[PDB]
């Protein structure tokens, strides 16, 4: 009955709420995106990031805005953008930057 | 006789009855003419020393041979033997063997005088600890993967075109390698430096997963592919190989890449690409190199920071986090005060100042980080000085674009201002003059660092400043306001730079400093304390000489003949006032001799 | 003015009426002279409309909005909308809006109300029935992702350079789209074929992940990159774009490479790479192209069959397993028989024969597969013929592995050997000599096919042999012994070759067929069957010609200028030309050798 | 505690033992090498293939020589070599061929 087209990638705002999103996962892997609404090279990977979400439904897809979350980007040490980050449990695992659809999809498989 | 001595092999009579399975294939290859003896997976502990001359390829693999059979003979050109529990090889091997493979074995050491006609020797996954001095010169391929070798011999066959040592336990490499070498693989070793002398025909050099800090400036011009990934590389060579095609320099500790990447040369058909992912770069470097590659006028090498197209983000982290980057000491008491320091205005400006200051290579140095840490403790308790440095940091953001150096100088100069307001300088005018001379020299240095940074791509303006300050500590007598610090590099400062900077500043002090002192500065704050009377009558001497002087009408009538300038006239007479007042108090004490030429 | 606007537009007062959080950032955007409006994660239901003048860019992401605000009344050059429910686009749009963003909507159709201001407009993840017949001539970027579009209009904005479509269920393209377009993306569309004429400035073409048969021959040379991966492509185009840099044709059904990759000059400074993976390639193509890569003088493009280095391995399948390659539908009862036939001598030779024969492009055609299946069907029963078929498969592989087409011809000829020996010819010479001239013709075809290979790289010799045979079925009177078979191509056969093929084979049949027929061959089996005594007489005469008086007269003149076998093969040959011409006249059928054709 | 030298790569000799080995894996992954003696490109990735066996102790490493085991080579459709094939629960997952160290290691983590 409940079938919203609103994908499965998930928006975040409150920093504290963001931390609770990592405990809501538990053992299943998540993917964090840091994007801006003015970033050129990020526009080419933004729609695609979502496309992946529904495919790899096993993992959680979190989208973070740098401008609307100055505390988040500073805490996770964002510099290059678009920057993607993955988490299982807690602890870093891996991160990387740049506009690349291949590297993004391959990394999810490389981990899970 | 071959038939006899092979069915004789059943006379030792071990448990394995599969010994006859080998003599079956031994006869089948004689009549069918297989020109090769293929036998493995058998389980054979030993083989005869006699093989038919018809054979030329002998295969022993994946069955235990606890040791070698002494003196094999016949006509073997290639001998393969892997995955066996072997201990040693004989010195009596057929001098017709051209290729020999030994993988997953247990060889502890290599004997002497191996077959001359041997071109290929494979020794992967063994236990070789030492390598022989004189191996046969016909060798053209040597591989010792997964082999704990402390150090390689200085002499080598000099005809090897492919040497692989990627294994374990290498401290360094000899400076005398095979001149005919085109490929070297020294990955996964624990070496820290590369020899200044390398084969002049070398094309492929892989030194990944090591501990190299600096690549030698005397690198073979024939090198096309260089891999220095997974290292502790601080900088990159100014002189890259002439025929360089690709350089994998990721997983390193580069902060800024060399200034010698303009145009470079496309000696190769494929555009030269340099991959430098996962390195803590400076924002000035990433920006300027990206701005280079963005413009179509660029003809240099393509530097890859990401995968991956990107856009640099400017985000100011909270100040309580920005301060911990300078002081290593972690305590709950200290951090709490910095949050209270973050509450007042212009705190975010200073928070961004600290990050943009420590975003270079030379400012990450422990000796420089130590004095900044001390300077932060000075602001941690002195509430008055902490307020005025935030204002200076605030004006740094508005003033043009990137003036972090001058901002750092103004707040360091502001320390003397607050020392004068409280009155640390009383009758120590003779002592503050010397302090005034040093700060004057630093301003001259700052002006020199601005002229220098304009021809520099990645060298920060701070490093040029701290360079000139440290390199001229002895020459310009920077005893105070400067600590004896060691820097990783001179920051592009040449010999002619120091010889010129020295002379210019000295002459700038023999003529300008007298006036300079008067316009300065914190000294004034002493004048209103050490001589309140003269300071009041001076203020009453500028409004007295501005009411109806003749210089106004002389200029006002001169301006119209040419075509709020009265303030520009006001400052012209103020400088003359500060000069007159200074010389009066100077003669009051014995400090008047101090503002002599000095240099 | 604007104060009265929203304060009374907060009057709707829906639940979670925190629109005051918006006005707490609305004025602040005007206080600090900002042109950027950040409106995000409101827990929204409905939005104030009038607001505001002089704001270039406003962001509306993470909303639970229902539709656009009425009468916006504001100067805006950039509008971003995401992750909210929308009917469509209100016509009320100012001519100042240069770019828009709509990435998550429940939209359904085209408003086709032009700001004329727009240059960038994406429509990701929101279904639309179709596309506007004429969009503003200022549009430069258009993205249509994860939707369902049936047809594209005949005229899009003449200066669109970037067009992205990944919508499900889009099937084919307008032949003409605007020429200036240089980048196009069309994947996940389940397409069929491409237009013959593309934009003459197109440099990037992406048609990955959709099912395409064959790409058009004529393409704009401006194309530098081409992604045709994950298709069902059979033959890559002969004339590739001149400026081709990187082409990826993996996950397809390629058997052989286009012939016209001899020297393919690559304009590109970087070498031209053609990536082809996971395709059932023939051994001939892999062997030839890779060997062609080993040559330093090779200036053609880079074909990467696998990454990176590799080596071809010739593994011989078991007999019965190679049979199912020709027998698609069959019962285990057939398998148990073929596995039993594996025990006989010359077994493996025929097993490799079926593989090499079936490792081409045209021999995988269903109708030719039917013919071979029917031929294999008789063999299961026959037994007697298989032994002769297996022994000719062994003699063909010991000389050269390439000679697989000659063996196939000698296997079909083997059928007429047993029948001629099984007494299947009741004095029906006139009927068998016709099969007699055809085999002669097919032999000449093989002779033409052998010399045709020498000027080609990827085409197999069998591909050429069947090409001439099938095409010259009507012109060479190949009525019997040959079933017509439609092929995917001419197998690299020029029209001028056919003219040469007709004349040469026709003449060869008129000149030396009399000499050839006598020697061929199964007729001997028939000849032994019809006149054994005259056979023996000419056989005894052959035995009595071993002691020839002038036998030494030939030998002594050879040693000066083993050896006496060639002359022996020449003498008895003339003896078989005489026994023929004699017995053939007895049955009133010396008429038939005759002459034929012209 | 017991420990043995050498790689974890198991050399096969019979198809009956080959089929037996992949059944005694369970949920684990099985990577199979298809190399030979005379082949050059096989030697380039050969030592690196054994090093992955010591690193990845989760998955099973098997090597099948084509020359003496042609029944298995035709069974798994080997056409070129070196060819790496990956199996789990007695079923083929991914197929890859070519002397590329990068793709081999990346393909392993892609599955596990």
Curated annotation (Swiss-Prot), chains A, D:
Task: State the PROSITE patterns in the record.
Answer: THIOREDOXIN_1, THIOREDOXIN_2
Q: Pfam families annotated for this entry?
A: Thioredoxin
* Record GO cellular component, one term: nucleus
Gene3D superfamilies membership: Glutaredoxin (3.40.30.10)
What keywords tag this UniProt record? Acetylation, Activator, Allergen, Cytoplasm, Disulfide bond, Electron transport, Nucleus, Redox-active center, S-nitrosylation, Secreted, Transcription, Transcription regulation, Transport, Ubl conjugation
Q: Subunit notes for this chain?
A: Homodimer; disulfide-linked. Interacts with TXNIP through the redox-active site. Interacts with MAP3K5 and CASP3. In case of infection, interacts with S.typhimurium protein slrP. Interacts with APEX1; the interaction stimulates the FOS/JUN AP-1 DNA-binding activity in a redox-dependent manner.
Please describe what this protein does.
Participates in various redox reactions through the reversible oxidation of its active center dithiol to a disulfide and catalyzes dithiol-disulfide exchange reactions. Plays a role in the reversible S-nitrosylation of cysteine residues in target proteins, and thereby contributes to the response to intracellular nitric oxide. Nitrosylates the active site Cys of CASP3 in response to nitric oxide (NO), and thereby inhibits caspase-3 activity.
Question: What PANTHER family is this protein classified in?
Answer: THIOREDOXIN-LIKE PROTEIN 1
Q: What is this protein called?
A: Thioredoxin
Record organism: Homo sapiens
UniProtKB/Swiss-Prot annotation, chain C:
One Gene Ontology BP term is:
killing of cells of another organism
> Where do the LRR repeats start and stop?
54-73, 75-96, 97-116, 117-138, 139-159, 160-179, 180-200, 201-222, 223-243, 244-264
Q: Which reactions is this enzyme annotated as catalysing?
A: S-ubiquitinyl-[E2 ubiquitin-conjugating enzyme]-L-cysteine + [acceptor protein]-L-lysine = [E2 ubiquitin-conjugating enzyme]-L-cysteine + N(6)-ubiquitinyl-[acceptor protein]-L-lysine
Ordered alphabetically, the record's keywords are: Host cytoplasm, Leucine-rich repeat, Repeat, Secreted, Transferase, Ubl conjugation, Ubl conjugation pathway, Virulence
Instruction: Show the active-site residues.
Output: 400 (glycyl thioester intermediate)
Q: Name one GO molecular function term.
A: ubiquitin-protein transferase activity
Stretch list, region Interaction with target proteins: 1-307
> Quick check: keyword Ribonucleoprotein in the entry?
no
Residue stretches making up the NEL domain: 318-591
Q: Which parts of this chain are annotated as the region E3 ubiquitin-protein ligase catalytic domain?
A: 316-598
Outline the segment boundaries, as ranges, of region: Linker.
308-315
After translation, the protein is modified as follows: Ubiquitinated in the presence of host E1 ubiquitin-activating enzyme, E2 ubiquitin-conjugating enzyme and ubiquitin.
Q: Does the keyword Acetylation apply?
A: no
Q: What is known of its domains?
A: The LRR (leucine-rich repeat) domain forms a slightly curved solenoid and may mediate interaction with target proteins.
Family the UniProt entry places it in: Belongs to the LRR-containing bacterial E3 ligase family.
Q: What binding partners and quaternary form does the record give?
A: Interacts with host TXN.
Please give the name of this protein: E3 ubiquitin-protein ligase SlrP
Taxonomic lineage per UniProt? Bacteria, Pseudomonadati, Pseudomonadota, Gammaproteobacteria, Enterobacterales
| Segment of the intact protein contained | 147 to 765 of 765
